[PDB]
Amino acid sequence: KYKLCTNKEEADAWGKKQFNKWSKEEKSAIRDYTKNARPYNEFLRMHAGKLDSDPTMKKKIESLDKALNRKEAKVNDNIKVYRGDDAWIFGKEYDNSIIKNGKVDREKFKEIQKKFQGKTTTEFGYISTSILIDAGYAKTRPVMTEFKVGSGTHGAYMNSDDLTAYPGQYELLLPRNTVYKIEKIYIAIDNNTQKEQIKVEATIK
Amino acid sequence: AIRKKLVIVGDGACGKTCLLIVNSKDQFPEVYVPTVFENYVADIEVDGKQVELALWDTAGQEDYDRLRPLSYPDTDVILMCFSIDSPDSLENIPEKWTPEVKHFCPNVPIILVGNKKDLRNDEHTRRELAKMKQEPVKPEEGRDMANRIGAFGYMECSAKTKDGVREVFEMATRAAL
Ligand SMILES: NC(=O)C1=CN([C@@H]2O[C@H](COP(=O)(O)OP(=O)(O)OC[C@H]3O[C@@H](n4cnc5c(N)ncnc54)[C@H](O)[C@@H]3O)[C@@H](O)[C@H]2O)C=CC1
Ligand SMILES: Nc1nc2c(ncn2[C@@H]2O[C@H](COP(=O)(O)OP(=O)(O)OP(O)(O)=S)[C@@H](O)[C@H]2O)c(=O)[nH]1
Ligand SMILES: [Mg+2]
């Protein structure tokens, strides 16, 4: 049973419970990442986790891993966290016109399901999430993912200037090379905007 | 380094994300253009001071008005955008965007931005506009508007050609200090 934060009050309450006593170096590593994450994550994916290519990226990535690898950098309980993605998360053969007039392409959606639903993947870049569904980009992107995060998982919680260049995002940052299983890929209708969106349920493993 | 916050707003499709993208990548997006742009701290130097300016992209469409407020706290400056392609989007400066931004970012400097500067002398545009008895926003209409809504100043740019893009962000950094 995973904790879900219904609003700001809950995110904050949960937020204070998290380790925050990083060292200076550890905060700077984490905050640097929030500044621009393309540099990290796109390097790791391109180079599949090997850091040998770029001395600077190497030290920068090695640093952050340490901040995220601290024994105390763990989430105490089981929590549901969220992120939105653009359609090309499922491959270069997809763009955001996959949703048109709040209508998900059934045909495209199906071949995406066949290819990913039930799949266990390993991600090379870090994994950015929010503990607040309304925060971050989950409502502003074609694909929303809900990660069920298990107790013991290493992560950093960030919602203040010392940790992130973008406070107000209620961020849980997951370490790189996290494995997760896509349990379900489906279409749900927004209660309000009344448009379609691709929802992904995944489990951290 | 001085850290500052910048939030960009304006009607859906008036070119916010492409403005932010061209500003960093220095290349207009053709095929994989996101709805909202990733976090990006632009380092800008104006008058001997280096600023790290966090840029916040927002969704312009009405459907997202309930979520947009989440982006407004502790903002140092607003880029308020309309398209030169669309007077409809300009009319929405005074009608939707200034009221919103004033309520949520009371007294936060405002830079009015006319996007798609390249479309002002575009035959196709001029023509599809003429069907509604409209024409491309004239510069003095952006200025007029900028003064009417109390903007720091007024700028026109084209992400497509990168015309004036650099200038917009230099100005925003000036109103952020
Ligand atoms: N995604 C969200 O809703 C959240 C984002 N953030 C912030 O955003 C930054 C990271 O979030 P993103 O914008 O997603 O950065 P990112 O580097 O993870 O994603 C950049 C672009 O690449 C795509 N992408 C991501 N992972 C991919 C993969 N494995 N394969 C193919 N394409 C992939 C994304 O859809 C996005 O279009 C962090 O700095 C954090 O501050 C924070 C909390 C939640
Ligand atoms: N001619 C011209 N077209 C542009 C320019 N900038 C963006 N566009 C086009 O206008 C469209 C909308 O641009 P975009 O940047 O996505 O708007 P937006 O403000 O981000 O829209 P939204 O996220 O609130 S729905 C895109 O098709 C883009 O190619 C420009 O400078 N000149
Ligand atoms: Mg956009």
Short mmCIF file of C-alpha atoms and ligand atoms in Angstrom, two decimals:
data_model
loop_
_atom_site.label_atom_id
_atom_site.label_comp_id
_atom_site.label_asym_id
_atom_site.label_seq_id
_atom_site.Cartn_x
_atom_site.Cartn_y
_atom_site.Cartn_z
CA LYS A 1 0.00 0.00 0.00
CA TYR A 2 1.66 3.21 -1.24
CA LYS A 3 1.30 6.70 0.23
CA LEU A 4 -0.24 9.22 -2.15
CA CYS A 5 0.02 12.96 -1.47
CA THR A 6 -3.32 14.60 -2.24
CA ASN A 7 -2.16 18.22 -1.86
CA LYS A 8 0.49 20.74 -0.78
CA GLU A 9 -0.10 20.19 2.88
CA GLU A 10 0.51 16.46 2.52
CA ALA A 11 3.56 16.82 0.26
CA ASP A 12 5.07 19.24 2.77
CA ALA A 13 4.31 17.00 5.71
CA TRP A 14 5.85 14.07 3.98
CA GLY A 15 8.61 16.35 2.70
CA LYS A 16 9.89 17.28 6.18
CA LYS A 17 10.27 13.59 7.10
CA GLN A 18 12.97 13.11 4.47
CA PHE A 19 16.74 13.26 4.97
CA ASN A 20 18.00 16.74 4.07
CA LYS A 21 21.30 16.89 5.93
CA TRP A 22 23.44 16.44 2.84
CA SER A 23 26.99 17.68 2.89
CA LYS A 24 27.77 20.88 0.99
CA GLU A 25 29.28 18.94 -1.90
CA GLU A 26 26.24 16.65 -1.86
CA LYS A 27 23.80 19.56 -2.10
CA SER A 28 25.79 21.16 -4.91
CA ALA A 29 25.80 17.91 -6.87
CA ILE A 30 22.04 17.60 -6.45
CA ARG A 31 21.28 21.27 -7.21
CA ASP A 32 23.55 21.29 -10.24
CA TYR A 33 21.47 18.47 -11.69
CA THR A 34 18.21 20.39 -11.31
CA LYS A 35 19.75 23.34 -13.16
CA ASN A 36 19.84 21.31 -16.38
CA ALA A 37 19.35 17.58 -16.46
CA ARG A 38 19.81 17.11 -20.19
CA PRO A 39 23.62 17.12 -19.69
CA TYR A 40 23.52 14.25 -17.23
CA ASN A 41 20.72 12.07 -18.49
CA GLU A 42 21.37 12.45 -22.22
CA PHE A 43 25.03 11.59 -21.73
CA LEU A 44 24.21 8.48 -19.71
CA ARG A 45 21.67 7.23 -22.21
CA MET A 46 23.90 7.95 -25.22
CA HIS A 47 26.85 6.24 -23.51
CA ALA A 48 24.80 3.55 -21.72
CA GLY A 49 26.11 4.28 -18.21
CA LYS A 50 29.85 4.36 -19.02
CA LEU A 51 31.36 7.65 -17.85
CA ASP A 52 34.79 7.26 -19.40
CA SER A 53 34.09 9.73 -22.24
CA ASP A 54 33.91 13.02 -20.31
CA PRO A 55 36.17 13.68 -17.28
CA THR A 56 33.85 16.46 -16.07
CA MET A 57 30.61 14.60 -16.53
CA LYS A 58 32.34 11.67 -14.80
CA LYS A 59 33.12 13.59 -11.66
CA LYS A 60 29.72 15.34 -11.74
CA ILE A 61 27.81 12.04 -12.13
CA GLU A 62 30.02 10.23 -9.63
CA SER A 63 29.36 12.99 -7.10
CA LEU A 64 25.60 12.85 -7.41
CA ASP A 65 25.54 9.06 -7.16
CA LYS A 66 27.28 9.46 -3.80
CA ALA A 67 24.72 11.99 -2.60
CA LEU A 68 21.97 9.63 -3.70
CA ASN A 69 23.85 6.58 -2.49
CA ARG A 70 24.12 7.76 1.16
CA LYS A 71 22.70 5.26 3.62
CA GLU A 72 20.30 7.93 4.89
CA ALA A 73 19.27 8.97 1.39
CA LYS A 74 16.33 6.58 1.42
CA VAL A 75 12.54 7.00 1.38
CA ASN A 76 11.10 5.70 4.64
CA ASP A 77 7.79 4.39 3.30
CA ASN A 78 6.13 3.19 0.12
CA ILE A 79 5.08 6.17 -1.96
CA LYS A 80 3.39 6.92 -5.30
CA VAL A 81 5.26 9.52 -7.35
CA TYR A 82 4.64 11.01 -10.80
CA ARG A 83 6.17 12.40 -13.94
CA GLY A 84 5.04 13.36 -17.42
CA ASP A 85 6.81 12.50 -20.65
CA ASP A 86 6.71 13.34 -24.29
CA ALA A 87 5.62 10.70 -26.75
CA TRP A 88 9.16 9.96 -27.89
CA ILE A 89 9.90 8.32 -24.53
CA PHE A 90 8.57 5.25 -26.34
CA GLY A 91 10.91 5.76 -29.26
CA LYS A 92 11.96 8.25 -31.93
CA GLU A 93 9.17 6.93 -34.16
CA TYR A 94 6.68 8.87 -31.97
CA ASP A 95 5.90 12.57 -31.45
CA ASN A 96 3.24 14.53 -29.56
CA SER A 97 0.74 14.50 -32.43
CA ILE A 98 0.01 11.01 -31.16
CA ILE A 99 -2.65 12.86 -29.17
CA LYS A 100 -4.92 14.94 -31.45
CA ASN A 101 -7.93 16.84 -30.13
CA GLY A 102 -7.56 14.93 -26.88
CA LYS A 103 -7.70 11.71 -28.86
CA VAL A 104 -4.91 9.15 -28.43
CA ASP A 105 -4.00 7.30 -31.63
CA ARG A 106 -5.43 3.84 -30.97
CA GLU A 107 -3.24 2.23 -33.58
CA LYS A 108 -0.03 3.85 -32.36
CA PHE A 109 -1.13 3.34 -28.71
CA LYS A 110 -1.58 -0.36 -29.33
CA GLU A 111 1.86 -0.95 -30.88
CA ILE A 112 3.27 0.92 -27.91
CA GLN A 113 1.48 -1.42 -25.54
CA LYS A 114 2.70 -4.49 -27.41
CA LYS A 115 6.24 -3.22 -27.19
CA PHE A 116 6.41 -1.95 -23.60
CA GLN A 117 3.53 -3.20 -21.46
CA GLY A 118 4.88 -5.71 -18.97
CA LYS A 119 8.44 -4.75 -19.85
CA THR A 120 11.23 -4.56 -17.30
CA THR A 121 13.63 -1.74 -18.19
CA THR A 122 16.78 -0.21 -16.74
CA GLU A 123 17.17 3.54 -17.04
CA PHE A 124 20.62 5.04 -17.53
CA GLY A 125 19.82 8.66 -16.69
CA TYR A 126 18.54 9.72 -13.29
CA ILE A 127 14.81 9.61 -12.72
CA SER A 128 12.97 12.83 -11.83
CA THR A 129 9.58 12.64 -10.14
CA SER A 130 7.10 14.62 -8.09
CA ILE A 131 5.30 13.44 -5.02
CA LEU A 132 2.51 15.78 -6.02
CA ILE A 133 0.62 14.76 -9.11
CA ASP A 134 -0.20 18.31 -9.96
CA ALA A 135 3.38 19.40 -9.73
CA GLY A 136 6.07 18.83 -12.26
CA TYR A 137 4.92 17.96 -15.77
CA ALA A 138 2.47 15.04 -15.35
CA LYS A 139 -0.55 17.03 -16.54
CA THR A 140 1.29 18.94 -19.26
CA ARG A 141 2.75 15.95 -21.14
CA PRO A 142 1.24 13.21 -23.38
CA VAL A 143 2.43 10.41 -21.06
CA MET A 144 1.99 10.40 -17.32
CA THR A 145 3.84 7.82 -15.31
CA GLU A 146 3.02 6.79 -11.76
CA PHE A 147 5.92 5.10 -10.04
CA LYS A 148 5.17 2.92 -7.05
CA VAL A 149 8.29 3.53 -5.00
CA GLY A 150 9.17 0.90 -2.43
CA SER A 151 10.49 1.43 1.08
CA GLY A 152 14.31 1.44 1.08
CA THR A 153 14.65 3.05 -2.30
CA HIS A 154 17.46 5.56 -2.53
CA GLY A 155 16.43 9.06 -3.48
CA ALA A 156 16.70 12.74 -2.76
CA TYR A 157 13.73 14.90 -1.90
CA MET A 158 14.04 18.45 -3.20
CA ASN A 159 11.83 21.42 -2.65
CA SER A 160 14.06 24.22 -1.37
CA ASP A 161 16.71 26.49 -2.90
CA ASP A 162 19.63 24.74 -1.23
CA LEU A 163 18.75 21.57 -3.16
CA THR A 164 17.06 22.68 -6.44
CA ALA A 165 17.11 25.64 -8.86
CA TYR A 166 13.40 24.95 -9.22
CA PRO A 167 11.76 24.84 -5.78
CA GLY A 168 8.00 24.30 -5.73
CA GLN A 169 8.23 21.10 -7.80
CA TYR A 170 8.09 18.61 -4.85
CA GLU A 171 10.78 16.49 -6.40
CA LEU A 172 11.94 12.98 -5.60
CA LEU A 173 15.09 12.19 -7.59
CA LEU A 174 15.83 8.48 -8.12
CA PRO A 175 19.43 7.24 -8.59
CA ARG A 176 20.60 6.19 -12.06
CA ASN A 177 20.41 2.59 -13.30
CA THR A 178 17.15 2.01 -11.43
CA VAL A 179 15.24 -0.93 -12.81
CA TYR A 180 11.49 -0.73 -13.07
CA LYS A 181 8.70 -2.80 -14.52
CA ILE A 182 5.91 -1.30 -16.62
CA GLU A 183 2.86 -3.07 -15.19
CA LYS A 184 0.17 -1.32 -17.21
CA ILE A 185 -0.02 1.14 -20.10
CA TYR A 186 -3.44 2.66 -20.66
CA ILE A 187 -5.65 5.51 -21.67
CA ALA A 188 -7.53 7.57 -19.14
CA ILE A 189 -9.68 10.64 -19.55
CA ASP A 190 -8.88 13.77 -17.60
CA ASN A 191 -11.70 14.45 -15.12
CA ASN A 192 -11.62 18.11 -16.16
CA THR A 193 -9.96 18.89 -19.53
CA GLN A 194 -11.85 15.87 -20.88
CA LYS A 195 -8.91 14.89 -23.12
CA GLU A 196 -7.12 11.56 -23.42
CA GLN A 197 -3.70 10.80 -22.06
CA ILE A 198 -1.44 7.80 -21.83
CA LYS A 199 -1.02 6.61 -18.31
CA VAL A 200 1.81 4.36 -17.25
CA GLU A 201 1.95 2.38 -14.03
CA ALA A 202 5.45 1.22 -13.16
CA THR A 203 7.01 -0.43 -10.15
CA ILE A 204 10.54 0.30 -8.90
CA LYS A 205 12.37 -3.03 -8.54
CA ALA B 1 25.98 34.73 -8.90
CA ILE B 2 22.52 36.16 -8.46
CA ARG B 3 19.78 33.57 -8.82
CA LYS B 4 16.52 34.80 -10.31
CA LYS B 5 13.22 33.34 -11.45
CA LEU B 6 11.54 33.98 -14.79
CA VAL B 7 8.09 32.65 -15.77
CA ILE B 8 6.88 32.82 -19.37
CA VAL B 9 3.17 33.16 -20.19
CA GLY B 10 0.88 33.82 -23.12
CA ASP B 11 -1.77 32.19 -25.30
CA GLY B 12 -1.38 28.56 -26.40
CA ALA B 13 0.69 28.27 -29.61
CA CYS B 14 2.09 31.85 -29.39
CA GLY B 15 5.60 30.38 -29.31
CA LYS B 16 6.74 30.25 -25.67
CA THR B 17 8.55 26.89 -25.72
CA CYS B 18 10.26 27.56 -29.05
CA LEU B 19 11.45 30.88 -27.61
CA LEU B 20 12.97 29.07 -24.63
CA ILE B 21 14.45 26.32 -26.82
CA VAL B 22 16.08 28.58 -29.44
CA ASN B 23 17.41 30.66 -26.51
CA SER B 24 19.46 27.72 -25.21
CA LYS B 25 20.01 25.16 -27.98
CA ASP B 26 20.30 28.00 -30.48
CA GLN B 27 18.23 25.93 -32.90
CA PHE B 28 14.55 26.12 -33.79
CA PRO B 29 12.61 22.89 -33.07
CA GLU B 30 11.06 21.25 -36.17
CA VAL B 31 9.83 17.74 -35.26
CA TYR B 32 10.14 16.97 -31.49
CA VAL B 33 8.75 20.15 -29.96
CA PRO B 34 7.51 19.65 -26.35
CA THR B 35 4.47 21.31 -24.82
CA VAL B 36 6.46 22.55 -21.86
CA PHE B 37 10.21 23.03 -21.79
CA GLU B 38 12.59 21.25 -19.41
CA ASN B 39 14.19 23.18 -16.54
CA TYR B 40 16.98 25.44 -17.74
CA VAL B 41 19.13 27.91 -15.86
CA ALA B 42 20.29 30.51 -18.35
CA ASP B 43 23.47 32.27 -17.36
CA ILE B 44 23.22 35.88 -18.54
CA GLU B 45 25.61 38.78 -17.93
CA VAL B 46 24.29 42.33 -18.00
CA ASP B 47 26.22 45.42 -16.91
CA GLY B 48 29.02 43.54 -15.15
CA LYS B 49 26.70 41.21 -13.20
CA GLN B 50 26.27 37.50 -13.94
CA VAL B 51 22.79 36.16 -13.33
CA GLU B 52 21.62 32.56 -13.20
CA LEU B 53 18.05 32.84 -14.38
CA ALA B 54 15.76 29.80 -13.93
CA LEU B 55 13.28 29.71 -16.77
CA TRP B 56 9.73 28.37 -16.22
CA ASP B 57 7.70 27.43 -19.28
CA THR B 58 3.92 27.32 -18.83
CA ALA B 59 0.94 25.97 -20.70
CA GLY B 60 -1.08 28.80 -22.28
CA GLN B 61 -4.38 26.96 -22.86
CA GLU B 62 -7.42 27.49 -20.60
CA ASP B 63 -7.41 23.84 -19.61
CA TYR B 64 -4.28 24.46 -17.56
CA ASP B 65 -5.29 27.65 -15.77
CA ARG B 66 -5.79 25.64 -12.56
CA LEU B 67 -2.20 24.34 -12.62
CA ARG B 68 -0.42 27.48 -13.80
CA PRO B 69 -0.46 29.19 -10.37
CA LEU B 70 1.87 26.49 -9.11
CA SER B 71 4.60 28.18 -11.21
CA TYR B 72 4.20 31.77 -9.91
CA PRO B 73 5.68 31.99 -6.40
CA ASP B 74 8.88 34.05 -5.91
CA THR B 75 9.04 35.10 -9.58
CA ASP B 76 11.57 37.83 -10.38
CA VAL B 77 10.18 38.64 -13.84
CA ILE B 78 7.47 37.63 -16.29
CA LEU B 79 7.82 37.21 -20.01
CA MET B 80 4.32 37.93 -21.20
CA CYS B 81 3.97 36.81 -24.80
CA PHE B 82 1.55 37.17 -27.68
CA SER B 83 2.08 36.29 -31.33
CA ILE B 84 2.51 38.97 -34.01
CA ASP B 85 0.75 36.27 -36.01
CA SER B 86 -2.45 36.79 -34.05
CA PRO B 87 -4.11 39.94 -32.68
CA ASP B 88 -6.44 37.58 -30.85
CA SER B 89 -3.44 36.69 -28.62
CA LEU B 90 -2.65 40.38 -28.02
CA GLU B 91 -6.20 41.23 -26.94
CA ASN B 92 -5.57 38.48 -24.40
CA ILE B 93 -2.71 40.41 -22.87
CA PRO B 94 -5.07 42.84 -21.05
CA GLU B 95 -7.97 40.42 -20.78
CA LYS B 96 -6.46 37.25 -19.36
CA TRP B 97 -2.73 37.45 -18.76
CA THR B 98 -2.21 40.73 -16.89
CA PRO B 99 -5.02 40.08 -14.41
CA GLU B 100 -3.63 36.62 -13.76
CA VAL B 101 -0.04 37.70 -13.35
CA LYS B 102 -1.00 40.73 -11.25
CA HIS B 103 -2.99 38.68 -8.84
CA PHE B 104 -0.36 36.02 -8.48
CA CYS B 105 2.82 38.00 -9.01
CA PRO B 106 1.76 41.36 -7.69
CA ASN B 107 4.16 43.98 -8.86
CA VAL B 108 6.48 41.64 -10.64
CA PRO B 109 8.22 43.25 -13.58
CA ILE B 110 6.64 42.47 -16.93
CA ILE B 111 8.30 42.20 -20.30
CA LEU B 112 5.84 42.13 -23.16
CA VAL B 113 7.12 39.95 -25.99
CA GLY B 114 5.84 39.89 -29.57
CA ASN B 115 6.71 36.46 -30.98
CA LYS B 116 6.91 35.29 -34.58
CA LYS B 117 8.27 38.65 -35.65
CA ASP B 118 9.03 36.99 -38.97
CA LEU B 119 5.35 36.50 -39.70
CA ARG B 120 4.60 40.26 -39.83
CA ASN B 121 5.62 40.47 -43.49
CA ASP B 122 4.28 37.06 -44.48
CA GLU B 123 1.82 36.85 -47.38
CA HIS B 124 0.13 33.73 -46.09
CA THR B 125 -0.34 35.33 -42.66
CA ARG B 126 -1.55 38.69 -43.96
CA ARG B 127 -4.00 36.77 -46.10
CA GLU B 128 -5.40 34.28 -43.60
CA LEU B 129 -5.67 37.29 -41.20
CA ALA B 130 -7.60 39.42 -43.79
CA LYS B 131 -10.33 36.76 -43.68
CA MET B 132 -11.20 38.06 -40.19
CA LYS B 133 -10.59 41.75 -41.03
CA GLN B 134 -7.40 41.45 -38.97
CA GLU B 135 -3.77 42.18 -39.72
CA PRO B 136 -0.43 41.49 -37.99
CA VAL B 137 0.17 43.32 -34.71
CA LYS B 138 2.02 46.54 -35.50
CA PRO B 139 5.04 47.32 -33.25
CA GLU B 140 3.47 50.49 -31.82
CA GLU B 141 0.52 48.33 -30.76
CA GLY B 142 2.82 46.16 -28.70
CA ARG B 143 4.45 49.27 -27.27
CA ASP B 144 1.05 50.84 -26.65
CA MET B 145 -0.03 47.68 -24.93
CA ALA B 146 3.26 47.49 -23.00
CA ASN B 147 2.67 50.98 -21.61
CA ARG B 148 -1.00 50.32 -20.91
CA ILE B 149 -0.24 47.24 -18.79
CA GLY B 150 2.77 48.85 -17.08
CA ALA B 151 5.49 46.71 -18.64
CA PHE B 152 9.21 47.19 -17.94
CA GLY B 153 9.60 47.49 -21.70
CA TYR B 154 8.55 45.94 -24.99
CA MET B 155 10.33 43.51 -27.32
CA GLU B 156 9.71 41.66 -30.55
CA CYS B 157 11.51 38.44 -31.56
CA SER B 158 11.42 35.44 -33.86
CA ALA B 159 12.54 32.09 -32.53
CA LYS B 160 12.38 30.80 -36.09
CA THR B 161 15.09 33.19 -37.26
CA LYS B 162 16.51 33.91 -33.77
CA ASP B 163 15.89 37.60 -34.42
CA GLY B 164 15.69 39.49 -31.12
CA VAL B 165 15.75 36.34 -28.99
CA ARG B 166 18.99 37.14 -27.21
CA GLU B 167 17.69 40.67 -26.62
CA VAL B 168 14.51 39.48 -24.85
CA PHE B 169 16.46 37.60 -22.20
CA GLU B 170 19.03 40.35 -21.71
CA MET B 171 16.12 42.67 -21.04
CA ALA B 172 14.41 40.21 -18.69
CA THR B 173 17.63 39.95 -16.72
CA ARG B 174 17.72 43.71 -16.49
CA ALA B 175 14.17 43.84 -15.06
CA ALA B 176 15.01 40.94 -12.73
CA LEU B 177 17.78 42.94 -11.08
N1 LIG C 1 9.11 14.74 -15.46
C1 LIG C 1 8.53 15.42 -14.47
O1 LIG C 1 7.29 15.60 -14.40
C2 LIG C 1 9.42 16.02 -13.42
C3 LIG C 1 10.49 16.82 -13.81
N2 LIG C 1 11.31 17.40 -12.92
C4 LIG C 1 12.44 18.27 -13.37
O2 LIG C 1 12.76 18.09 -14.75
C5 LIG C 1 14.10 17.64 -14.91
C6 LIG C 1 14.06 16.21 -15.41
O3 LIG C 1 12.76 16.02 -15.97
P1 LIG C 1 12.64 15.82 -17.56
O4 LIG C 1 12.21 17.14 -18.18
O5 LIG C 1 11.87 14.55 -17.80
O6 LIG C 1 14.19 15.57 -17.91
P2 LIG C 1 14.72 14.29 -18.74
O7 LIG C 1 16.17 14.54 -19.14
O8 LIG C 1 14.34 13.06 -17.97
O9 LIG C 1 13.78 14.39 -20.06
C7 LIG C 1 14.09 15.20 -21.21
C8 LIG C 1 13.28 14.76 -22.43
O10 LIG C 1 13.69 13.45 -22.78
C9 LIG C 1 12.61 12.51 -22.62
N3 LIG C 1 13.12 11.30 -21.94
C10 LIG C 1 13.34 11.15 -20.62
N4 LIG C 1 13.82 9.92 -20.33
C11 LIG C 1 13.94 9.25 -21.49
C12 LIG C 1 14.36 7.89 -21.91
N5 LIG C 1 14.78 6.97 -21.01
N6 LIG C 1 14.31 7.60 -23.22
C13 LIG C 1 13.88 8.49 -24.14
N7 LIG C 1 13.47 9.74 -23.83
C14 LIG C 1 13.48 10.17 -22.55
C15 LIG C 1 11.55 13.23 -21.81
O11 LIG C 1 10.22 12.86 -22.15
C16 LIG C 1 11.79 14.68 -22.18
O12 LIG C 1 11.08 14.92 -23.40
C17 LIG C 1 14.80 17.70 -13.58
O13 LIG C 1 15.81 18.71 -13.60
C18 LIG C 1 13.74 18.06 -12.57
O14 LIG C 1 14.19 19.28 -11.98
C19 LIG C 1 11.10 17.22 -11.62
C20 LIG C 1 10.05 16.46 -11.12
C21 LIG C 1 9.10 15.78 -11.98
N1 LIG C 2 6.82 31.53 -38.04
C1 LIG C 2 7.16 31.26 -36.77
N2 LIG C 2 6.57 30.18 -36.12
C2 LIG C 2 6.88 29.90 -34.83
C3 LIG C 2 7.83 30.64 -34.15
N3 LIG C 2 7.95 30.15 -32.89
C4 LIG C 2 7.12 29.09 -32.77
N4 LIG C 2 6.45 28.92 -33.96
C5 LIG C 2 5.47 27.87 -34.27
O1 LIG C 2 4.26 28.13 -33.58
C6 LIG C 2 3.77 26.91 -33.00
C7 LIG C 2 3.62 27.08 -31.50
O2 LIG C 2 4.89 27.28 -30.91
P1 LIG C 2 5.14 26.81 -29.38
O3 LIG C 2 6.46 27.35 -28.95
O4 LIG C 2 4.98 25.35 -29.15
O5 LIG C 2 4.01 27.66 -28.62
P2 LIG C 2 3.72 27.51 -27.04
O6 LIG C 2 3.57 28.87 -26.49
O7 LIG C 2 4.81 26.70 -26.43
O8 LIG C 2 2.32 26.79 -26.96
P3 LIG C 2 1.71 26.00 -25.67
O9 LIG C 2 2.78 25.09 -24.98
O10 LIG C 2 1.27 27.01 -24.51
S1 LIG C 2 0.18 25.00 -26.39
C8 LIG C 2 4.73 25.79 -33.39
O11 LIG C 2 4.24 25.13 -34.54
C9 LIG C 2 6.00 26.52 -33.78
O12 LIG C 2 6.68 25.86 -34.81
C10 LIG C 2 8.43 31.72 -34.80
O13 LIG C 2 9.22 32.41 -34.16
N5 LIG C 2 8.10 32.02 -36.10
MG MG C 3 4.70 25.29 -24.96
#
